[PDB]
Design a protein around this ligand. Structure first.
Ligand SMILES: [Cl-]
Ligand SMILES: [Cl-]
Ligand SMILES: [Cl-]
Ligand SMILES: [K+]
Ligand SMILES: [Mg+2]
Ligand SMILES: [Mg+2]
Ligand SMILES: [Mg+2]
Ligand SMILES: [Mg+2]
Ligand SMILES: [Mg+2]
Ligand SMILES: [Mg+2]
Ligand SMILES: [Mg+2]
Ligand SMILES: [Mg+2]
Ligand SMILES: [Mg+2]
Ligand SMILES: [Mg+2]
Ligand SMILES: [Mg+2]
Ligand SMILES: [Mg+2]
Ligand SMILES: [Mg+2]
Ligand SMILES: [Mg+2]
Ligand SMILES: [Mg+2]
Ligand SMILES: [Mg+2]
Ligand SMILES: [Mg+2]
Ligand SMILES: [Mg+2]
Ligand SMILES: [Mg+2]
Ligand SMILES: [Mg+2]
Ligand SMILES: [Mg+2]
Ligand SMILES: [Mg+2]
Ligand SMILES: [Mg+2]
Ligand SMILES: [Mg+2]
Ligand SMILES: [Mg+2]
Ligand SMILES: [Mg+2]
Ligand SMILES: [Mg+2]
Ligand SMILES: [Mg+2]
Ligand SMILES: [Mg+2]
Ligand SMILES: [Mg+2]
Ligand SMILES: [Mg+2]
Ligand SMILES: [Mg+2]
Ligand SMILES: [Mg+2]
Ligand SMILES: [Mg+2]
Ligand code: NA
Ligand code: NA
Ligand code: NA
Ligand code: NA
Ligand code: NA
Ligand code: NA
Ligand code: NA
Ligand code: NA
Ligand code: NA
Ligand code: NA
Ligand code: NA
Ligand code: NA
Ligand code: NA
Ligand code: NA
Ligand code: NA
Ligand code: NA
Ligand code: NA
Ligand SMILES: [Sr+2]
Ligand SMILES: [Sr+2]
Ligand SMILES: [Sr+2]
Ligand SMILES: [Sr+2]
Ligand SMILES: [Sr+2]
Ligand SMILES: [Sr+2]
Ligand SMILES: [Sr+2]
Ligand SMILES: [Sr+2]
Ligand SMILES: [Sr+2]
Ligand SMILES: [Sr+2]
Ligand SMILES: [Sr+2]
Ligand SMILES: [Sr+2]
Ligand SMILES: [Sr+2]
Ligand SMILES: [Sr+2]
Ligand SMILES: [Sr+2]
Ligand SMILES: [Sr+2]
Ligand SMILES: [Sr+2]
Ligand SMILES: [Sr+2]
Ligand SMILES: [Sr+2]
Ligand SMILES: [Sr+2]
Ligand SMILES: [Sr+2]
Ligand SMILES: [Sr+2]
Ligand SMILES: [Sr+2]
Ligand SMILES: [Sr+2]
Ligand SMILES: [Sr+2]
Ligand SMILES: [Sr+2]
Ligand SMILES: [Sr+2]
Ligand SMILES: [Sr+2]
Ligand SMILES: [Sr+2]
Ligand SMILES: [Sr+2]
Ligand SMILES: [Sr+2]
Ligand SMILES: [Sr+2]
Ligand SMILES: [Sr+2]
Ligand SMILES: [Sr+2]
Ligand SMILES: [Sr+2]
Ligand SMILES: [Sr+2]
Ligand SMILES: [Sr+2]
Ligand SMILES: [Sr+2]
Ligand SMILES: [Sr+2]
Ligand SMILES: [Sr+2]
Ligand SMILES: [Sr+2]
Ligand SMILES: [Sr+2]
Ligand SMILES: [Sr+2]
Ligand SMILES: [Sr+2]
Ligand SMILES: [Sr+2]
Ligand SMILES: [Sr+2]
Lengths: 56, 237, 73
RNA sequence: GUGGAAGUCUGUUAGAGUUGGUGUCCUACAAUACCCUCUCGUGAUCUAUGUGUAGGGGUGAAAGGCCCAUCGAGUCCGGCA
RNA sequence: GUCGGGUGAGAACCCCGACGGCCUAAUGGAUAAGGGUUCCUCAGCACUGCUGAUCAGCUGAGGGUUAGCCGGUCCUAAGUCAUACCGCAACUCGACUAUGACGAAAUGGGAAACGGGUUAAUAUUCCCGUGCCACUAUGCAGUGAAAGUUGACGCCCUGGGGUCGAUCACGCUGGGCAUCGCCCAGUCGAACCGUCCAACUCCGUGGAAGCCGUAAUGGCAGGAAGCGGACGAACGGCGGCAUAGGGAAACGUGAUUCAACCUGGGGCCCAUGAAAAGACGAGCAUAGUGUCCGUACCGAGAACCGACACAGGUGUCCAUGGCGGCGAAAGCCAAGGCCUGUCGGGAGCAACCAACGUUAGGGAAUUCGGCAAGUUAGUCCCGUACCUUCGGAAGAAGGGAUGCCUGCUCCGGAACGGAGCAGGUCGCAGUGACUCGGAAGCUCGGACUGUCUAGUAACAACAUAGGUGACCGCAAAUCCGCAAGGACUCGUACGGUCACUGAAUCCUGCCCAGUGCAGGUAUCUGAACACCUCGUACAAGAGGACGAAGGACCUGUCAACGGCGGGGGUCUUAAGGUAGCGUAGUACCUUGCCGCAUCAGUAGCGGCUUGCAUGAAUGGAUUAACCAGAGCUUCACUGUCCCAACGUUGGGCCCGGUGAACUGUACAUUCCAGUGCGGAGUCUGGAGACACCCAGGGGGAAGCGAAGACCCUAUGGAGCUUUACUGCAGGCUGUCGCUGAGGACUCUCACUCCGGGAGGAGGACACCGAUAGCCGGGCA
RNA sequence: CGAGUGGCUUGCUACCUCGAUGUCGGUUCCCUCCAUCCUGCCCGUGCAGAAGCGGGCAAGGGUGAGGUUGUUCGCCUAUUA
RNA sequence: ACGACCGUAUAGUACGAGAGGAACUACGGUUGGUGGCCACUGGUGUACCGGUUGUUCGAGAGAGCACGUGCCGGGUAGCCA
């Protein structure tokens, strides 16, 4: 069984969903954590300096 | 390289955990104020998943239903006693001090009141040898002479299920089923059969530990494999 | 006996299984009454079909050598 | 004679797999497909869903295998022009 | 698919009928996930659709999903999160312990709904009929009320009860067929209420010393059979429900085999097969309340994932439709679905290719190799070797039979079950198609089933049971974490950790010098602190004394790393290869030599064997069984071959429509020679050469596709190794702090551990902080 | 001992090619060379004959099937002008 | 577009003590190669005719399906060796 096309047919699990806090489809319904804004993980909003060029 | 199997164990992930949610109970002796005024009736005999040996369900006078580490010879209906004044008979528990020298005992406590630590496995038994006002001497299953507080509680008789080890598993499948009831990763891939990156013995054209197996006690985890601090090896001499 | 093992495993392994189980399945004298109606119920668990006495014993024998020692001493 | 054990046999039952054809395909139906043959099929079996283990770390009946077409150290962005 | 026809400006593919076909665990019915309006209607064809299109999953516009009793909602599972506590420089980080919450929509547990009717689209939701559950109120009854029971459970074999379905017999209703007299369909009717009870258990009676009983096991004076009784089942029987419903009509009755469902008996475990909410226990009348969320449709060779309307992938139930047969097998056929695994038209339709049928004689000569193809085949009877772990080998091998028809016998209660007999009789052929093993021997390997490189490796590799060695008495050994803490562990030596070998059988020699591990150790060596001398009004610093682990030194140990030679009739460096096996999957020499077998055998097998360079758990030998494992031989068979032929289906070719990509410095009709950076269509000399087009098989363009994988180079990279360099964790050990009282000692008060507690054990140690010496590819 | 020809073997060189000119053996299909194995015609002989042995002209045609081995080569078998 | 061989007569002759043993020439045939043809033999022949298994159309008759003939037997034209 190839890792490619044939293995793609087994994918019918819902993980990432519309996030209550930020509105992005990043709320992982299994972990109950938003990979985009951090909801469910932290009160503070998920943010990182590497999201932009260092001097900008 | 990569951490060896022995190091993966320590993390306690599911693969290495025992099926505790399927275990019955921890056959620890009952706690009595004093007097020995405690007796119960063997209500049933059950299989203990964690030890592959039988356990006896007992109902005590004061209304407490608990499983007990049963010796060989205990059956339904029988009456058991637990306390200083307990009768000297198989299945009864009392402090070593009350036990007569030369009597086979099991589920011996290490420290008075801990519930029992020694000789709990199938068909084994400790042998109470010397008595005293300060120290009770017991010969444990390994043949070691152990010095215990005469206050350490114990059960008369040998543990039920003796001889379990006399029959060969015969097939992998049987080993399999037993291993599924323990905190153990099985089957076992030999270190010499792995890649160098995975074990000190891995690598090489033909399989062989390109090094002596007797490893020092001071060796760090990841390197402490093979024959740990062996005082000797082989069968010779 | 080990006939269910066919030509597999080899002598020893299946010779002991036959002997162990041969003795295991024999009629055993019940400690309670005196009849030879004791059958194994599971690992180390024995019962008499006559008086219904359910008790603990060896894994494959109702009584073990070490077990018959506690009596003495 | 009865009985009906078995990591037991036959078996395209379901289901799982893949020895050979070095067949077909090779801007494919398909970034691993098609056909015939072949193997397993009461058990260390197969399978659904849920759940756990996370990057020098997992997981590995050990092939440096597998961890979302990527693994002798994943992916993303940043360090970075 | 074809012939007619319908609609339309337009019809091969939109619709109707007929004829012809395809699908049967699916190409049919219901659904989970996922999708998200794809569902229904009307109007459309610019877009999307492998051609066309009046069609549509497409475009425009409207419409559609109705619940006390179907899910959710409730419970708890593996397990998750939150708060508290503690750690951390810190946190959105981290382990334990408390508390709380979260965690199952087909497929865990669970109060209660059936039948029919209705719409373009919903429907146990609406409507009709009937019924049921929970709570609450009122009334009657009730003092019970919590013990127990249930929820609630593994694997294998099996009896009994029993519905649907299917089938048989006969009757009734309707249809079909028309030499017969047959063939098909229907013959209905729920939940619910009431009632019946087999099995199990038990009681009374009885009184078996050999009887009772089973498919089997089994039962009994501790009381068998028999007789009576208590308790007690179905999604089942029976009555109501039902001058409900449904049907054009009839609107049946018995039987056999019996899925569901109910209830028992047996066997297995070094394996023991959830929990909780809830329910019962615990009556009845009447009335009220029962909110909130889901509900369409697809569920796949076009509604999901795979960029696609993708031959892939994707769970559940329909597992009892007919013939067939052992069968949930093949083949054929219903119910139901479809002609959308969606471009057509034409040419006896050439070459060539993919799949396939048939081939005289020879029969593996083909080939690395019988690769490919074929041979055999189902069932019954006879019969069956070597060898063997006594199981097996084995369906060994080899031999014979096999249909139909007429009349019967036996087993069984019987089957539309099975086993035989006699006579008759047809074919080339009776497992007539389909289904359906080719067989035998020798050798190597691994014992076996099992595992593996998703995507070139299925093997001899990994695993395995078995054998062995090592560590550890649990305040342990081993392992994870910076810490708080944690796995092993509801575990305790018959344990579980770390390794090696790899079933059974017969065995497993010699070596402790080096290296590793471990133990010991007079003496030697061995750091820091404190101490002492010198030095400094102090300090830096120099030296001394004491000396832990460690090393020197000694001993133990090879199923510990490994080793078992050269020379002479000992030497290096400890020993100097024993049993076995041997030209090996190890033997260079080598096609060794002898033999077997063949016309001929670098092969294979047996023997010899000085073994370039076999050898005992780096396991040796051997081995029945097993194997999509490597090699060899034989019988059988055959288009593999001699040597090719004819045929079949789909392409190819021509026509309508649709309609890409690769590749392209330029020029280019070349050929023979030469030359040139020595491998030129293009330079030189000749030769040949009128342009264009179709089909072909691929000689050349050092053809296209990839900044060669091989090799080297770079004061490139990475993974891996070690007695490379340098460091870092970690372990051991001394010392200082915690730390107290009276080179050996006692105590208790810190601190640690056991204990529910009292109290017990230990104790200035241990843990922890700091530092010093040793080890330290575990890591950088 | 001396003198040459070839470019089938081997060695040497590093001239071409590392932004790839795919390897050995075999197979199939075509053209060629002669230093001729057979066939045609000749000369010599230690040529009676038959047959050998050596030599000359000559490339029209032919040069096959099999056993081991991947093998090339070769060893071997029966045929053959 | 033809190459080569065997055999017979020559002849048991020439030659030679014998053993052995030719040729010119005239014939018949085989083999390899080549071109063509199908009266003959052979193959094919999913034209066709027949036999027959399972199933469906109620039986009969006559048919479909079982892969592009279910299977088996025979085989015209044509094509072929
Ligand atoms: Cl074990
Ligand atoms: Cl639902
Ligand atoms: Cl029964
Ligand atoms: K090159
Ligand atoms: Mg316990
Ligand atoms: Mg497990
Ligand atoms: Mg192993
Ligand atoms: Mg490996
Ligand atoms: Mg390593
Ligand atoms: Mg899963
Ligand atoms: Mg509907
Ligand atoms: Mg399609
Ligand atoms: Mg033939
Ligand atoms: Mg050949
Ligand atoms: Mg084959
Ligand atoms: Mg009868
Ligand atoms: Mg060999
Ligand atoms: Mg194997
Ligand atoms: Mg692969
Ligand atoms: Mg395989
Ligand atoms: Mg082992
Ligand atoms: Mg063992
Ligand atoms: Mg072991
Ligand atoms: Mg091994
Ligand atoms: Mg192995
Ligand atoms: Mg040989
Ligand atoms: Mg040895
Ligand atoms: Mg080894
Ligand atoms: Mg090329
Ligand atoms: Mg390059
Ligand atoms: Mg390289
Ligand atoms: Mg490097
Ligand atoms: Mg504690
Ligand atoms: Mg390194
Ligand atoms: Mg060069
Ligand atoms: Mg010449
Ligand atoms: Mg002559
Ligand atoms: Mg020529
Ligand atoms: Na028997
Ligand atoms: Na295959
Ligand atoms: Na990494
Ligand atoms: Na009823
Ligand atoms: Na049937
Ligand atoms: Na179409
Ligand atoms: Na198997
Ligand atoms: Na040594
Ligand atoms: Na050796
Ligand atoms: Na196998
Ligand atoms: Na053929
Ligand atoms: Na070409
Ligand atoms: Na690397
Ligand atoms: Na030359
Ligand atoms: Na070649
Ligand atoms: Na010639
Ligand atoms: Na040869
Ligand atoms: Sr696939
Ligand atoms: Sr899935
Ligand atoms: Sr969180
Ligand atoms: Sr931030
Ligand atoms: Sr405990
Ligand atoms: Sr405890
Ligand atoms: Sr190694
Ligand atoms: Sr020894
Ligand atoms: Sr099996
Ligand atoms: Sr099978
Ligand atoms: Sr292959
Ligand atoms: Sr084939
Ligand atoms: Sr491919
Ligand atoms: Sr079966
Ligand atoms: Sr991948
Ligand atoms: Sr960058
Ligand atoms: Sr379906
Ligand atoms: Sr138009
Ligand atoms: Sr539609
Ligand atoms: Sr919940
Ligand atoms: Sr449910
Ligand atoms: Sr099951
Ligand atoms: Sr029955
Ligand atoms: Sr629906
Ligand atoms: Sr599909
Ligand atoms: Sr139909
Ligand atoms: Sr179309
Ligand atoms: Sr024919
Ligand atoms: Sr052959
Ligand atoms: Sr051959
Ligand atoms: Sr036969
Ligand atoms: Sr696999
Ligand atoms: Sr494969
Ligand atoms: Sr062995
Ligand atoms: Sr040593
Ligand atoms: Sr020897
Ligand atoms: Sr062996
Ligand atoms: Sr072409
Ligand atoms: Sr190039
Ligand atoms: Sr010449
Ligand atoms: Sr000649
Ligand atoms: Sr050779
Ligand atoms: Sr003649
Ligand atoms: Sr003569
Ligand atoms: Sr047909
Ligand atoms: Sr046949």
């Amino acid at each position: 069984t190839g890792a490619g096309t044939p293995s793609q047919g087994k994918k019918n699990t819902t993980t990432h969903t519309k996030c209550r806090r930020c509105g992005e489809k990043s709320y992982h319904t299994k972990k109950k954590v938003c990979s985009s804004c951090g909801f469910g993980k932290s009160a503070k909003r998920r943010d990182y300096e590497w999201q932009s060029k260092a001097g900008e | 390289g990569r951490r060896i199997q022995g190091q993966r164990r320590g993390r306690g992930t599911s693969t290495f955990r025992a099926p505790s949610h399927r275990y019955k109970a921890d056959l620890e002796h009952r706690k009595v104020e004093d007097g020995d005024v405690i007796a119960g009736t063997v209500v049933d005999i059950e299989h203990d998943p964690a030890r592959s040996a039988p356990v006896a369900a007992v109902e005590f006078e004061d209304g407490d239903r608990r499983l007990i580490l049963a010796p060989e010879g205990v059956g339904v209906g029988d009456e058991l006693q637990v306390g200083v004044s307990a009768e000297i008979a198989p299945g009864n528990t009392l402090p070593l001090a009350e036990i007569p020298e030369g009597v086979p005992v099991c589920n011996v406590e290490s420290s008075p009141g801990d519930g029992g630590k020694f000789a709990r496995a199938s068909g084994v038994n400790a042998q109470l040898l010397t008595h005293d006002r300060n120290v009770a001497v017991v010969k444990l299953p390994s043949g070691e002479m152990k010095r215990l507080d005469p206050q350490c509680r114990a059960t008369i008789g040998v543990v039920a299920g003796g001889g379990r080890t006399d029959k060969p598993f015969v097939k992998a499948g049987n080993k399999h089923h037993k291993m599924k009831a323990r905190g153990t990763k099985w089957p076992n891939v030999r270190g010499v059969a792995m890649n160098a990156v995975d074990h000190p013995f891995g690598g090489g054209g033909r399989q062989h530990p390109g090094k002596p197996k007797s490893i020092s006690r001071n060796a760090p985890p990841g390197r402490k494999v093979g024959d740990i601090a062996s005082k000797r090896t082989g069968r010779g001499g | 006996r080990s006939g269910r093992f066919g030509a597999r495993y080899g002598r020893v392994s299946r010779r002991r299984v036959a002997e162990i189980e041969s003795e295991m399945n024999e009629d055993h004298a019940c400690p309670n009454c005196g009849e030879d109606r004791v059958d194994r119920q599971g690992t180390g668990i024995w019962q008499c079909s006559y008086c219904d006495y359910k008790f603990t014993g060896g894994s494959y024998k109702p009584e073990t050598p070490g077990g018959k020692t506690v009596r003495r001493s």
